[PDB]
Amino acid sequence: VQRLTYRRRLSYNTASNKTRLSRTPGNRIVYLYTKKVGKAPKSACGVCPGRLRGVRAVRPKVLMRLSKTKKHVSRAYGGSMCAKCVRDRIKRAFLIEEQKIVVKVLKAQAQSQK
Amino acid sequence: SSHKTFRIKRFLAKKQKQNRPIPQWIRMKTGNKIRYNSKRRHWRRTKLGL
Amino acid sequence: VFIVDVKANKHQIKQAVKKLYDIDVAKVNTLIRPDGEKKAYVRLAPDYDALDVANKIGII
RNA sequence: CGACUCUUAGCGGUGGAUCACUCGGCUCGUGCGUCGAUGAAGAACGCAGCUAGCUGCGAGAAUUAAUGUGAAUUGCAGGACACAUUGAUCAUCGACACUUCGAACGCACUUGCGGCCCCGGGUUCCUCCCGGGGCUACGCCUGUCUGAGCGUCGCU
RNA sequence: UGGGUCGGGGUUUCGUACGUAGCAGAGCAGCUCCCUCGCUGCGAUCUAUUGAAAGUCAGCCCUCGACACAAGGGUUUGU
RNA sequence: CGCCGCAGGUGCAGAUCUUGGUGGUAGUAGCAAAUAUUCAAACGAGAACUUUGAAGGCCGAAGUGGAGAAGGGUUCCAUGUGAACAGCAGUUGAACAUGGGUCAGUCGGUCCUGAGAGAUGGGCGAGCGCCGUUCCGAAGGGACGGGCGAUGGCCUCCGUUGCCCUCGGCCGAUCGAAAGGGAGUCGGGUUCAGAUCCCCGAAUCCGGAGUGGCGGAGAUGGGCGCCGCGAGGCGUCCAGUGCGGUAACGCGACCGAUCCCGGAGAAGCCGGCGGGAGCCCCGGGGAGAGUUCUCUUUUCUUUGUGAAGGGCAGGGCGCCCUGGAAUGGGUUCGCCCCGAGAGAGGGGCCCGUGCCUUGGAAAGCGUCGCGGUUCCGGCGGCGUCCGGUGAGCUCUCGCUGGCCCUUGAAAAUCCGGGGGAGAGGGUGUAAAUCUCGCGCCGGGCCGUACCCAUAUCCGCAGCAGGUCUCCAAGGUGAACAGCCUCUGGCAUGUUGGAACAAUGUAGGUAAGGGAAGUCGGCAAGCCGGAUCCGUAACUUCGGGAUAAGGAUUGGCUCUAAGGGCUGGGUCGGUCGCGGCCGGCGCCUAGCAGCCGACUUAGAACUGGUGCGGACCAGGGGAAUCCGACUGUUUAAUUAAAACAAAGCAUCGCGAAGGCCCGCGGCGGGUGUUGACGCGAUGUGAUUUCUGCCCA
RNA sequence: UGAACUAUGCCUGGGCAGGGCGAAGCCAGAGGAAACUCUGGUGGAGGUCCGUAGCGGUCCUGACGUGCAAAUCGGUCGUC
Ligand SMILES: [Mg+2]
Ligand SMILES: [Mg+2]
Ligand SMILES: [Mg+2]
Ligand SMILES: [Mg+2]
Ligand SMILES: [Mg+2]
Ligand SMILES: [Mg+2]
Ligand SMILES: [Mg+2]
Ligand SMILES: [Mg+2]
Ligand SMILES: [Mg+2]
Ligand SMILES: [Mg+2]
Ligand SMILES: [Mg+2]
Ligand SMILES: [Mg+2]
Ligand SMILES: [Mg+2]
Ligand SMILES: [Mg+2]
Ligand SMILES: [Mg+2]
Ligand SMILES: [Mg+2]
Ligand SMILES: [Mg+2]
Ligand SMILES: [Mg+2]
Ligand SMILES: [Mg+2]
Ligand SMILES: [Mg+2]
Ligand SMILES: [Mg+2]
Ligand SMILES: [Mg+2]
Ligand SMILES: [Mg+2]
Ligand SMILES: [Mg+2]
Ligand SMILES: [Mg+2]
Ligand SMILES: [Mg+2]
Ligand SMILES: [Mg+2]
Ligand SMILES: [Mg+2]
Ligand SMILES: [Mg+2]
Ligand SMILES: [Mg+2]
Ligand SMILES: [Mg+2]
Ligand SMILES: [Mg+2]
Ligand SMILES: [Mg+2]
Ligand SMILES: [Mg+2]
Ligand SMILES: [Mg+2]
Ligand SMILES: [Mg+2]
Ligand SMILES: [Mg+2]
Ligand SMILES: [Mg+2]
Ligand SMILES: [Mg+2]
Ligand SMILES: [Mg+2]
Ligand SMILES: [Mg+2]
Ligand SMILES: [Mg+2]
Ligand SMILES: [Mg+2]
Ligand SMILES: [Mg+2]
Ligand SMILES: [Mg+2]
Ligand SMILES: [Mg+2]
Ligand SMILES: [Mg+2]
Ligand SMILES: [Mg+2]
Ligand SMILES: [Zn+2]
16 A cells, blocks of 8 residues: 655644645545634523534634625624524513613602602 | 754854865975865764754 | 855845846745855746846856 | 794884974063953854965955055966056055944844834835835933923912 | 496385376255256365375495596605 | 083882883684575676676565654765775775755744743842842823824825824733644646755735726615606605525625624543545456466456535534424433423534536556657557445544543634714715725745664764654454565675584473472473353452363354345326326235345364464462552662552641741742641551550 | 753643453343342443553573673563
C-alpha cells in the first residue's frame, strides 16, 4: 500500500494538524489539511442546551465574510436567542407588566380611606 | 535546523566563507612564512561556538 | 537573476531594475544565499524578453 | 659455517639537545598625562582583480581630500604616472566621510511592530500603496505655553 | 606402470519415491434419447508397480569399465 | 678565551620531579554483538570491498521503508584527485579540491495570551541596584457626535485643520509558544541538486478605492380631477429604511452611532454503538507480464478526478404544526423517552469530507506504434469498465453513557441581537444606504538545501548507549505477538583467507538414578494455547481460581443450526398487448425466487497414537516471618521488611492570626484561602484492643 | 556561573496491541400464602489480572571488565 507523509513541518498530531485523505487526478493519495469543525451559536437564555437553527456553523473569523442572512433568523433576537425563550420572554414581560397594573389599581382603590 | 533566525544564518555564512584554503600566490610573497590555513574547520571535527 | 543588497526589499529591487535597465517587471522572488548574499529572481513582463535584455546587459 | 645476543668503531637513520644568532620580553627612568549622546570602550557584519588569517578600513570600505615628499607598488596581472594646463609611492593628517549592535535613545528583540511632519512616484491631493528624508528614550536645570486645587486671598 | 576423477558392484541408513492403474475409498456435485444400474468431475487415504526411492567416504570395502594426468618444478648438502 | 678583580637565576641520578623524545613489551593483544554471500563483466597500473547484470539471503509496515521537530551547518548536488583520513583495502566516500544549489499574501515565524518574566508610580537600599505588578499615580493624547471659526481647495459642497462641549475603566507598559489560539492554495509538470514557493491551470483570504467602477436592491404604488371609444397619457394629493411562511424558518441585498447583552474562539479521561472515507478482501471485463515437463478461461501488475462553487443522497436535531396516549406505548447493544405532549402524519434546520456536475481530460496513468530539437510538457492509436461484501484495520464525523473530595486555559480576533441618538427625498433623473453580483489595485520582512541517526545530533570517534513524532500491505493467529512474504531498502555492521586443537562465549542432547550437588534447586528443566468437565482450605464474602486434577485437539468428506433482499391479487367490466376505478378475492400454521458472511455443533472416513506438530505459550501444593494492597526509592554494587499511602490520633490558629520566607519596606508564601480550612506531628488498610505512671 | 543531566511545582502538547475476571444498573422466567427468594441473559466498573509498545531494572551474583560502553549487552524479569 502507498504510505503517506505530512506536507508541512508540523510533525505532531495536534488539533491544528488534522488531515484527511484525498485522491488527486494524478491517482495518488495525499493529505488535505482540514479546517476545524465550527459550532452554531448557543442561545442567550443560558438554559436550552441545543444550538440555534438557521445559522451556518463556521469558525468565528469566517463569519466576517458570510452575508447577514446566513448569520441570523428573521425574528426579534433572531440568531442570538432560541424561539422558545423569545416566546417565554414576550409572555413574561406582558404578564409582569399586567401584574404591575394590578398592584397599582389595588393600592389606588385601597387609599380612598383617610 | 531548517528554522533559523537571520542572525544565526548570517553567522553561519561568515564561518562558511572563511573556511577555505589560502591562495597559492600567498606562498610566493616576500617574507611570507605562512604555509596553510591553520584555522580550517571541519563540520564533524570541531563544532561551532553557537 | 541578480545578486542584490541584503537590505533591499522586493519593492526596491523592482524599482531599481526598472530604472537602470528600462524594463517592466512582473514579480520579484527573493532568497538569501547560504553565503549571505541576497539573490533576486526578477520575472519580466510578457512584452519584455529576458533573453535580449540579458544581451544588452552583457551577461548572455 | 651461519642465525641470535653482547661489546666497540665507521657510516646511515630517528630525535632535536648544544652552540651561535634575535624586528621579543623583563626591569628602571623621563616627558606628556588625552574617552563618551557632536554617540565611547567593546562587539557583529562587510570591504581587495586574484585574499583564508593577521593587519587596515566602513557602502566614498587594504581607503577620498589636503600637505610634505619625489618615481614607485610588486606574489602575479592590469593600467596609469609630459614629474609643468602638477605627480607613482610613502609619510603626515587639520577637510570630508564613518554600516549594525552597544550608556544605545520610538516600542521590542534567539522575533518584529508603530506614530508624527515634509518630498517624490502610482495618485493625477484625498487620502490608500511604494520609496526617500527628519523626528519620536530616561532623568534633570533655566525659561515658555497649557492647565489643577471645598490651598490663601481680592473684586463682583 | 601408478595414483586420481567419474561409473559399477558390495555394505549400510531410512522406510515403499514420482508417474501410472484400480468395481479401493467416508462421501459429495453434475448427465439421464443414454443409462436399467450406470457415467463425468472433486476426494484425505489405501492397494499394485515397489524391501521401492534416495544417500553412502568426504577418514567404508572391491574394481581394472570410462577419462585425463603423470621421468616435472624449486632450494641446498663434501671426508 | 687566558690572567687580576667584581657579581650571580652558578655544577643533578633520583623528588610516584617538569617538558620533550625514545625503547622492551611486540609485529604482540587485538580488528569475534545483531544469519551471507556467489558468478560474470566494465572502468582501472592495481578489485574480496567500486559500478552494472544475474543469483541466494536479510530488514518484514512497532522496518534496516517514506517524511519531519531539536541539534548540526553545507555534511546537499555535479565534476575531478588519490598525499593524509575513512583502525584491511578502495577505482569509493559525509575526505580533499573546484563550481553550483534553498524562489511564498494563502507552509511557518510574525499576531494573542499561558505558567511566568518585567519597567513606570511608590517603597527600600551605603551603593551597583531590588521589592513590588496594581499595589501609596493628576496613569484615558482617543472618538463618528455638536459648536466657534481659520474656507487651506474643482473656496457649489465635501474633505482637511486649531480650540471648546459631550462621550471614553481591559484599572495598566512590555515580553512570553516554529506542538496551544490564529482569515485564506490546490492539481499537473519541471531540476544534478528547490518547489503546496518555479512554470502551467484552476481558486481563495485580507486590505484599499477620495474625486464614487458597472449592475441589482432601497424603489418607484395608490386616491382624486381631466384628455382620450378603449388601451394609454397629464395635473394634484398621500405612502413607500424589502418580502414570504400558522410555525420551525426562508428569500440576493435588507439604513443606523455611542451604549448594553450574548455567542464563537473555548475545552478532561474512558466506554459502547452508528455514518462516511482510505486500505484490505471477493466476482467478472480490458492492457501488459510470469508459468506451461503436465495441469491451470490461470498467477502477478494496473485499471484517476484537487481546491472552490451548484445540485442530490446520507447522517444528526433537546426544532415546528395537527392531535391527545392505560389494555400504556415507543425504543436502544446498553439505555432511555412521554399530558412540561408519546406513537402517527406533515414540515424546518445543521453537517454534508459521500455521489453527480463546472473544474475534466486538454492533464495524469497503462499499453501499442511513428518521427526528432546531439537530452521534443514531441506526434498518434487504444483504454482508463461493471459489480459484491464486512464485529475487518486506520482516520473522521455523530449519538449516548460512565468517572472525579480531580470538573479538565487565557487572550487576540470575529459575529449576532437589544435600543433608536441620527441620516436621507418630495414622487424624482429619486435620495441616504447596501453583509447582493461582477469589475480594479496591492500583500512588504525572515526561514525554506540536506541529515534526522547501528555514519550528518550528544556521548573525545562513522561509539552495540541516548535522542520528540507522523504513515503502516498479504498469510497464520486473539492480536500493532512471534514466524514467512510484497512495496521500499540493505550488504551483515571499522578486515578477509585457510583450518576445526585446548580453554572459553552462546546454544543443544544424554542411558540408569532423580537434588545424593550446593550456603541455598543457583542454572536448566517441567508446565503452557483453546474446548469440555472439575475445583479445597481460608476469607474482609469481593476473592482464593488458569486453585488442584482430568479428557480432547490433525487431515479429509459431509450434515445441522445461526441471515438479508424483493415479490404474495379475483378479473379487457377495455384501449391509456399496457395504463385510470371497481361488481371482481382469501397468503393471514406463510410461501416463491435470488443473494451473503463467518461461527458453532454433530458424524463418517483416515494416518506407524500423530495433531496448540514451527511460532506463541502459567510448574504446582502445604506452611512461617514482614509489609495491608496499587505506588516509590540509593542514575553507577542495597528494589527491601525501607519510604509513601488510605485509615486512626494529637497539636496550633478567628486574620492586629497560626506556620513560614525576607538584608530591607505593614515587604512576601499558604491565600482566587477561613476551622468540612490552613499549618505541624506521630502511627500506618480492615477487625480487635490500646493497661498503669505527671516523680 | 550553572535546573541542556537530574529533583519537584506549574503551563501547553503527544501516547499507551490483544485477551481474562465480570461491580452497579436493566430485561425475562420460575418458586412462594405472603414476605421475598432463585435462575438465565444484558451491562462493562476497577490506583482489576495475563501480556505487547513504552517505562523500569529481579536474577544469572551470565557477558564485558586496557569494554561497544568512564554503567553497556543477552536471557529472565516488574508494571503496563
Ligand atoms: Mg558529533
Ligand atoms: Mg522568502
Ligand atoms: Mg647518527
Ligand atoms: Mg592623498
Ligand atoms: Mg515572538
Ligand atoms: Mg482657588
Ligand atoms: Mg559406489
Ligand atoms: Mg638554580
Ligand atoms: Mg636528568
Ligand atoms: Mg594476533
Ligand atoms: Mg578476531
Ligand atoms: Mg525474512
Ligand atoms: Mg526513517
Ligand atoms: Mg554526497
Ligand atoms: Mg585504512
Ligand atoms: Mg569538504
Ligand atoms: Mg484607565
Ligand atoms: Mg508576543
Ligand atoms: Mg500553532
Ligand atoms: Mg527535496
Ligand atoms: Mg471529476
Ligand atoms: Mg472525489
Ligand atoms: Mg412524535
Ligand atoms: Mg488521456
Ligand atoms: Mg526540505
Ligand atoms: Mg550508535
Ligand atoms: Mg564534546
Ligand atoms: Mg558503523
Ligand atoms: Mg555475521
Ligand atoms: Mg563484511
Ligand atoms: Mg539422564
Ligand atoms: Mg531418564
Ligand atoms: Mg544436600
Ligand atoms: Mg554434600
Ligand atoms: Mg531459576
Ligand atoms: Mg492456591
Ligand atoms: Mg477428527
Ligand atoms: Mg509492599
Ligand atoms: Mg496491616
Ligand atoms: Mg526507580
Ligand atoms: Mg544502584
Ligand atoms: Mg539493583
Ligand atoms: Mg489500624
Ligand atoms: Mg497520615
Ligand atoms: Mg529541563
Ligand atoms: Mg492494573
Ligand atoms: Mg499486571
Ligand atoms: Mg556479573
Ligand atoms: Zn432558551
